[PDB]
Amino acid sequence: NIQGITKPAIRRLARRGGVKRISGLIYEETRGVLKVFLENVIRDAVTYTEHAKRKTVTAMDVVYALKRQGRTLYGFGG
Template sequence: MSSRGKGSKGGAKRHTKACSQGGVKCISGLIYEETRGVLKIFLENVICDSVTYSEHARRKTVTAMDVDYALKKQGRTLYGFGG
């Protein structure tokens, strides 16, 4: 433990204690890697379908409705969005 003066705790220890007093649970750092991978695959699928819709309409811009249709195709309809 590095000494920082009178009774000072390390930054990580102080934040860990404050977080656990606030009800935050400690989780493994590997969770973030797996979550990032799953999110990347999901976004790749949505973007690929969105681009397909815009290419079919011969547009160079992907609109919000293209994304809406791509999500609907995957069974993840956005509630209250668009027509």
């Protein structure tokens, strides 16, 4: 599941980030960091959705979650 974030996808992300050479343990470290970030953001989004008494996590819940974390995103009904 978490391994579904493929090693080459991480290389592509790093390449867009300007990285030339990548270490082996990097990929696992990035999987962990992405896991933590998604955990926090989804936790806030769920908190919002639960407070909305809805069984569907909506995009506005996600946007509010990133707004809380100081990671504001545009293009999804801000």
